[PDB]
Amino acid sequence: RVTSKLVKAHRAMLNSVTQEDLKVDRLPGADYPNPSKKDKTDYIMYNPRPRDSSENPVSVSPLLCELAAARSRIHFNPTETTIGIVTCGGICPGLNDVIRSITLTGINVYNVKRVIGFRFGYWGLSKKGSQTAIELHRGRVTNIHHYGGTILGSSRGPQDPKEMVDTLERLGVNILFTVGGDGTQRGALVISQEAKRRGVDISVFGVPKTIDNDLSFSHRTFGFQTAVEKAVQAIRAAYAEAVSANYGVGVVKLMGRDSGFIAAQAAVASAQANICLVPENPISEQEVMSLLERRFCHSRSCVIIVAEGFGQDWGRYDASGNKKLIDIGVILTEKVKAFLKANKSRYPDSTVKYIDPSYMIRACPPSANDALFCATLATLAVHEAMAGATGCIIAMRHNNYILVPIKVATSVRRVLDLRGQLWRQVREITVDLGSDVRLARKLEIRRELEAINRNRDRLHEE
Amino acid sequence: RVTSKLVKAHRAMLNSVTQEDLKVDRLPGADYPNPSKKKTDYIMYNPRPRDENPVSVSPLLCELAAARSRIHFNPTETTIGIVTCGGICPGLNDVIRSITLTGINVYNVKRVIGFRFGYWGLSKKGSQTAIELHRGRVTNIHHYGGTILGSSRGPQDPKEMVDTLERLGVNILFTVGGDGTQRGALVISQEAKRRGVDISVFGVPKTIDNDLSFSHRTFGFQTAVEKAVQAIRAAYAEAVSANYGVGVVKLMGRDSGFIAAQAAVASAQANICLVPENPISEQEVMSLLERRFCHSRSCVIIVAEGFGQDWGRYDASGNKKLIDIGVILTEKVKAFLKANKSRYPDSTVKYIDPSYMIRACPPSANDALFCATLATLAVHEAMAGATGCIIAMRHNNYILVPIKVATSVRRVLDLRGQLWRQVREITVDLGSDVRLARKLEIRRELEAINRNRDRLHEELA
Amino acid sequence: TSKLVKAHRAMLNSVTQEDLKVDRLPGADYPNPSKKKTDYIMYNPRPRENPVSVSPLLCELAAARSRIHFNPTETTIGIVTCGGICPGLNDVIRSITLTGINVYNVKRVIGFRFGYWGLSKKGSQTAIELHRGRVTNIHHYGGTILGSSRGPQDPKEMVDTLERLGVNILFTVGGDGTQRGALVISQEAKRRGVDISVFGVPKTIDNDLSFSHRTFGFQTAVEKAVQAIRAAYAEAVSANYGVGVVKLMGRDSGFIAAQAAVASAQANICLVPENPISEQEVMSLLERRFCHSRSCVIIVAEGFGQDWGRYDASGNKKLIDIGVILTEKVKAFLKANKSRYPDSTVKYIDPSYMIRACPPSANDALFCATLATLAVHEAMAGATGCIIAMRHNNYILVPIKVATSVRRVLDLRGQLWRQVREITVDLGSDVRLARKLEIRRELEAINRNRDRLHEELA
Amino acid sequence: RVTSKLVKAHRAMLNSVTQEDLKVDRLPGADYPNPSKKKTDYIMYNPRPRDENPVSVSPLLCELAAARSRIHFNPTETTIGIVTCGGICPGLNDVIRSITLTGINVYNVKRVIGFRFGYWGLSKKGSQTAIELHRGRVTNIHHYGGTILGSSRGPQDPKEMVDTLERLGVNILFTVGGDGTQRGALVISQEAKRRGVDISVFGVPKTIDNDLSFSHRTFGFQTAVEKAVQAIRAAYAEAVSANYGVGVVKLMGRDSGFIAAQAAVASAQANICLVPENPISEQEVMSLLERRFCHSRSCVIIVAEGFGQDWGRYDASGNKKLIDIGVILTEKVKAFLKANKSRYPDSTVKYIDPSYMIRACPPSANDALFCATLATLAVHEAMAGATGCIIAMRHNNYILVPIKVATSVRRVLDLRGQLWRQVREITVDLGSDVRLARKLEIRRELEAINRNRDRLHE
Ligand SMILES: Nc1ncnc2c1ncn2[C@@H]1O[C@H](COP(=O)(O)OP(=O)(O)OP(=O)(O)O)[C@@H](O)[C@H]1O
Ligand SMILES: Nc1ncnc2c1ncn2[C@@H]1O[C@H](COP(=O)(O)OP(=O)(O)OP(=O)(O)O)[C@@H](O)[C@H]1O
Ligand SMILES: Nc1ncnc2c1ncn2[C@@H]1O[C@H](COP(=O)(O)OP(=O)(O)OP(=O)(O)O)[C@@H](O)[C@H]1O
Ligand SMILES: Nc1ncnc2c1ncn2[C@@H]1O[C@H](COP(=O)(O)OP(=O)(O)OP(=O)(O)O)[C@@H](O)[C@H]1O
Ligand SMILES: [Mg+2]
Ligand SMILES: [Mg+2]
Ligand SMILES: [Mg+2]
Ligand code: NA
Ligand code: NA
Ligand code: NA
Ligand code: NA
Secondary structure, three states: OOEEEEEOOOOOOOOOOOOOHHHHHOOOOOOEEEEOOOOOOEEEEOOOEEEOOOOOOEEEOOOOEEEEOOOOEEOOOOOEEEEEEEEEEOOOOOOOHHHHHHHHHHHHHHOOOEEEEEEOOHHHHHHHHHHHEEEHHHHHHHHHHHOOOOOOOEEEOOOHHHHHHHHHHHHHEEEEEEEEEHHHHHHHHHHHHHHHHOOOOOOOEEEEEOOOOOEEEOOOOOOOHHHHHHHHHHHHHHHHHHOOOOOOEEEEOOOOOOOOOOHHHHHHOOOOOOEOHHHHHHHOHHHHHHHHHHHHHOOOOEEEEEEEEOHHHHOOOOOOOOOOOOOOHHHHHHHHHHHHOOOOOOOOOOEEEEEOOOHHHHOOOOHHHHHHHHHHHHHHHHHHHHHHHEEEEEEEEEEEEEEEEEHHHOOEEEEEEOOOHHHHHHHHHOOOOOOHHHHHHHHHHHHHHHHHHHHHHHHHHH | OOOOOEEEEEOOOOOOOHHHHHHHHEEOOEEEEOOHHHHOEEEEEEOOOOOOOEEEOOEEEEEEOOOOOOOOOHHHHHHEEEEEEEEOOOOHHHHHHHHHHHHHHHHHEEEEEEEHHHHHHHHHOOOHHHHOOOOHHHHOHOOOOOOOOOOOOOOOOOHHHHHHHHHHHOEEEEEEEHHHHHHHHHHHHHHHHHHOOOOOOEEEOOOOOOOEOOOOOOOOOHHHHHHHHHHHHHHHHHOEEEEEEEEEEEEEEOOHHHHHHHHHHHHOOOHHHEOOOOOOHHHHHHHHHHHHHHOOOEEEEEEEEEOOHHHHOOOOOOOOOOOOOOHHHHHHHHHHHOOOOOOOOOEEEEOOOOOHHHHHOOOOOHHHHHHHHHHHHHHHHHHHEEEEEEEEEOEEEEEEHHHHOOOEEEEOOOOOOHHHHHHHHHOOOOOOOOOHHHHHHHHHHHHHHHHHHHHHOOOOO | EEEEEOOOOOHHHHOOOOHHHOOOOOOOOOHHHHHHOOOEEEOOEOOOOOOOOOOOOEEEEEOOOOEEEOOOOHHHEEEEEEOOOOOOHHHHHHHHHHHHHHHHHHOOEEEEEEEHHOOOOHHHHHHHEOOOHHOOOOHHOOOOOOOOOOOOOOHHHHHHHHHHOOOOEEEEOHHHHHHHHHHHHHHHHHOOOOOEEEEEOOOOOOOOOOOOOOOOHHHHHHHHHHHHHHHHHHHHHHHEEEEEEEEEEEOOOOOOHHHHHHHHHHOEEEEEEOOOOOHHHHHHHHHHHHHHHHHEEEEEOOOOOOOOOOOOEEEOOOOHHHHHHHHHHOOOOOOOOOOOOOOOEEEHHHHHHHHHOOOOOOHHHHHHHHHHHHHHHHHOOOOEEEEEEOOOEEEEEEEHHHHOOOEEEOOOOOOHHHHHHHHHOOOOOOOHHHHHHHHHHHHHHHHHHHHHHOOOOO | OEEEEEEEEEOOOOOOOHHHHHHOOOOOOOOOHHHOOOOEEEEEEOOEEEOOOEEOOOOOOOEEOOOEEEEEOOHHOEEEEEEEEEOOOOOHHHHHHHHHHHHHHOOOOOOEEEEEOOEEEEEEEEHHOOOEEEEHHHHHHOOOOOOOOOOOOOOOOOOHHHHHHHHHHHOOOEEOOHHHHHHHHHHHHHHHHOOOOOOEEEEEEOOOOOOOOOOOOOOHHHHHHHHHHHHHHHHHHHHHOOOOOEEEEOOOOOOOOOOHHHHHHHOOOOEEOOOOOOOOHHHHHHHHHHHHHHOOOOOEEEEOOOOOOHHOOOOOOOOOOOHHHHHHHHHHHHHHHHHOOOOOOEEEEEOOOOOOHHHHHOOOHEEEEHHHHHHHHHHHHHHHHEEEEEEEEEOOOOEEEEEEHHOHHHHHHHHHHHHHHHHHHHHHHHOOOHHHHHHHHHHHHHHHHHHHHHHHHH
């Protein structure tokens, strides 16, 4: 009963996935030796669950994923390779660790000719933008891992692939590392394709950026654990506010656009959520109000976590073509205010406080563990691209680093499994509809009556 | 010379302040000895000399708070009550906890009562929810934000409230909260006198803004600044990540800009700092932004919540609700950058409102110590029959100050002070030739880099 | 980046599928109130038509079960925490209690004080009853509210206690020692025909448990360690020929040391037990560091350098303090070379207790709760003699005998350790040409800088 | 009745202090206008009245620090120098950064020079490593502990140092450091006078201990208290986890106990607080511990590093090295509990020395603000030719104070003050009948629980 689930992507490139789809494209040939390693691809089962010990276990699936690793032979000539980095889309903890590690691995391990950082996402690759490219060196990236955001900066909206490749050519780029999400990596493919049309010796390698941890073929993306730490700190605040008011409601919106991993993890980690609203589990304003009522039958406080992709069906694009969400944080808060107002009887006093800790989550520096994670991804990213990997992203599954072709990855998305342990834990700690309000509380205060008497004895026995 | 300034309160009770006004009311007589210690000392309101020994430029003296040899209430028979009212602020639980423990540990009082949800917990209805505070209850509450007692907005009937105080045997009510709260305390105190009730009403001032008069520091304030700065770094991260990126973050200052200002300087990251003391027009702000965007691709704008209330068009307690200047300013800045898509090709505005995260978060270690000291001294003085007053801190000393005085004046930024002078230094300036200013910038830079270039050549071999 | 190795006191010399099978109290007649056969996962997902594991081993997946062995409303759960302290003990304690009380509505939960001592005839008088009100907020605190202890107790006394108190499940939270004790307790309870599950929640801040990629507390330890490293780094940078030496937890392995070294980006030398080197080699690395820098940060795991010189109540071998010894050797070295290093300072940081006695990261908390929750599920379903663990992002059940027979260790050929090699001083570099190719990288950079800024004026 | 007290310094330069002593030396003349501001004000040393307007109980006035209309140095031609000496303390980089920026932004000075590794950077040899500080260099340093300039211990030749100041064109040297540092400053200032050099020597006081006279707060101090408290929680966690567990944590206080005391109260967790102001014997400490162990299974002992120096038997600068009381106290406590295995069956002592983590960690937001203000004012006054003095803060105001006065007295805990009175409250007390004290404890408890029991029945 695992806690994630796969699902077709809103804009899938493949409708089915086969082993060939999973094979990673490589620039032709690998003639130089690896200074790092002063001999062939290893794989890992996509799914380690067996069919049919006995004679050796056979996977319930035919799929293998390529393991990322440093390689004996590499494709590019180390001391002559130029590496490029761009960061696109929203910001997320660990961008600067990615930037820094790519640079240092290039410079320290492979002793590359130069590292170029492109400004403000793909815009920095445009004819106009290219004038702002900077050269990244040890001194530039030494301390950037202490800061949120991206020193390169980022942007939204497309650029002309022909301009971008023009730029890559003019500057002598051999590897462009594209750090960003779904949009970014789709752009990567376009760039990669245009370079091919030209017969340019260029790897385009993706480092996946999604604070939501909704990437397919992945159990963890950088930034995500940090977002959970911060979200929990948001939740404590909301909890403080609710407890301080008779019929107090703390509503806090968390990141989840298409999935509720942050919302769920934070709900359980904090032990403080009473209602947890995720996109996987669309419910009506009436149900929410109903859960709130139940909560207010036995408590004077209620914390409601809501993922930003929840309740999009509750009412009525950006430069990149992404569908703008309606702010469910604001809308839900208003509906809850409405509800408690229309019931001034039952709830004499009552307060609703709303917290949107969005930017503080995304624009804050990485946890130590996220840093380590970023550095590992980035390091391996450089290893594989040096060995001519292209058209793929690096990811992590089953505690292993793998290579995955952009087409596969952008075709499916990870989603909460409502039958999973994580979501089962959210159901445990939150208010429940399916409980006789009466007997439920009756079996509460009795659990209490017991406890206090055990208490009373123990202390007399003093 | 100060970074603060005094100003008449929006609803002042005194129009002038005299020594007699500063005298603290005391329940008649002090017959019991102080178990803790098994006449009143003063401090000059103003330590600046006029014109042999220096003479204050002012006649005012303030009474120093301290544990007293003789006390008014009979320790082992006194009942203490605590209520928290108004908004929440870091340190409420440390206050609650310290009052309780000082009462219980030092004076060995009969009982401590905590009243729920502000003054509502003193109403006939509310009183049913009063709880008894004991060591076990308050042991660990200092680790949490908010108030375990809870708080509320809106008035109660002083006759009901005193009824409650009488029925429960309360000898001291500690009222923890703001201007409103302390005004309510006077009412309560007055009604208790009309009845000849032996009751002290003592205020522990609660203002996250640090805008209390006769005070240089109120609990929660330093914690607010730590948190604000953290908010500012986020806004700065967002701005730096975007070509012509603007991070707008709203901070607490309702009638004053101390938090805004301190956080601006502490962070080193603010480009524009908007406070109520210094009302400027949308056009001026846009103008400062333009100047910032002449030499930088990023701008962080701090705005206090009481700024720009004159830029456009009540709560249960009668407080005037503010228009959200964070939201309005953000929109105006969006409007401005949109209407200038030419000059600024790309451009982004991100708004952060860290309000509840600041107010509902636990105290720094230093705030905790501060809370405990205030609360401790509060118990000392009220045991010694002080009433109608608050405890406060001036010139590194704890003083007693009558509610009437304190609610008549408020502390405000002095724009001629060092703090504000530092805000002027670090932020964009209007009165600089945009051109020659940047010219003398990149030249400072050209220098630097060449010093750099030499140093590193002087490195090889 | 890990590797398996025989345990210092192994119970099995080889591991077979049958060894991996988890013992279950006979029969499962009651329904699970929570859910108003066993699934497995390959021990090794590398392949040798559908892929075939390079290994025959399967591990049992932990999960809530349709049928359970104990009668929920009549089961009594007990908890004990033993050995050293580690971040997340209270989360474990709290989650076991709440899962028992909320999900299974068990009769009662008992907390035993000060490790196994609380199960002794004497100790048992101090047992307390855990209820929602008791555990509500303990996850905010380091340490263990139950307390812990070192040293054995009489298994007959302990089982006496379990019987007298009506315990149906004892959760033993702790390390290798603890779980070995658990088997003893479990065995004695069988000799008596007692209906008792003894289930282990593994506690090792080192992350050196076999059949496991992550144990609770570990990620928190790394956060804290990195904070220690920054301090050391601050101290080194503030002194001409400054050395910051900071000791980290690793007794038999170097996972914390290594992860913290890379996470911080600040370690110049990283000393782990997997890679024993001589005082002379360390001094040599330091010299190379001091050829191109005025600062050096040295991370050393506590199990390093035990061979550099000459027991506790539980029988554990006490280590010599390598932190103190190494610091002294480094002082000696820099003193004996006052010539080359005019000034020079050594500051030593031992952040040990601050690491172990501090509250869990949010992620660790989630992790603790999940482990504890599943632990309750499986023990309700009569699992015993085993621990819960996590491999390949999955929770599994593993018999104490297997787990205590092997240990996880750094693989020096792995990515983690390869990253430590990258960021740290290297022996095998021509000191000269290495620095020559340094300042040249620099000369370049500055000139790029100098142009960019000239191209700035006007 | 305050919480500090004054005391003669171990190496006082004045035996009495008069108003003339308090007057701040100024380089002759002030002819240039202040670009910032496009006579001296004072404050009473003591605001308590004697006996119409109140008269100070003291004749002393202190000069208020402020930006001045006229300044002494020609702004666009002044060269500023910065050195940091002595131990490290949170806020050094904020000081460095603010001096630089105030110089560069406000006064538009010619150049800012940072000297490396304390006074050594001013020696003939050291001077070769001087670096030029500019906006780009100091932009982000406030995020780091330590000092980018670095520091050192041990004297240099004043003639060399002034040679350096002259050769480089320094008009103001800002000396950031302690007592030793500022004494060095006077020497440097004196030698420059002998030469008729136009040089201000201005001190920014550095003492993490908050024991500076004429001062209520020095930078770093509040940050130290935050960190110390965090150390204390760890020790508390360790003590609570062990039957008769003792957490001993050593804090910074060399000659005073402000950090120890503040941290003891702030944490609410200390049972015993040992400061230098209150020397007690091993027997008394052991005795307080016994009392603690009469009603509790845990004890946290805070000890300041200058405590217990009389309990047993120099550095490059001539400072007296302390015996490690942390280590010695821990041992004595171990001895004591060992020799009483009877009364305390089990028992553990865990010792935490969070020293470097406190000193080498970045400033709280409030400390940063403080550092920047001090530094800013420092630059204002030195531009207006103040010299031979330090900037300090008393009664929420910034004042100028001559090094001679400041190095002659030191701030010390007042055992009759509120702070120390609070330490007495929260800690174990000797002067309580062990028996009736606990009797009146559990009775307070018996009450409480019954109030509890009713409430919950209701
Ligand atoms: N299908 C596509 N083809 C070419 N370019 C694209 C495509 N989709 C997105 N891009 C470009 O890639 C960049 C980033 O895309 P987008 O704004 O969707 O961010 P993302 O990488 O999906 O991250 P996030 O999930 O934070 O939005 C933008 O320049 C966008 O215009
Ligand atoms: N003048 C007054 N007389 C009697 N009661 C008052 C008065 N002003 C306010 N109160 C009551 O005291 C309580 C607190 O008032 P208010 O909500 O203004 O808090 P405050 O102390 O101003 O703190 P904050 O700064 O958070 O607003 C409310 O219940 C309010 O109705
Ligand atoms: N082989 C064994 N048989 C029975 N009991 C044991 C055995 N080994 C250890 N124990 C007991 O289990 C308890 C905990 O053991 P120990 O102190 O070694 O902790 P641990 O689980 O190893 O944790 P840590 O990793 O902190 O050492 C002790 O009381 C010890 O006496
Ligand atoms: N009396 C003195 N005359 C001249 N120089 C001195 C004197 N005392 C100390 N110094 C020098 O000043 C520098 C710092 O002095 P010291 O090491 O005593 O630290 P400090 O400033 O008192 O700081 P801390 O409080 O951290 O010890 C050293 O170079 C030292 O040699
Ligand atoms: Mg997208
Ligand atoms: Mg062991
Ligand atoms: Mg000294
Ligand atoms: Na409540
Ligand atoms: Na300005
Ligand atoms: Na150094
Ligand atoms: Na190495």
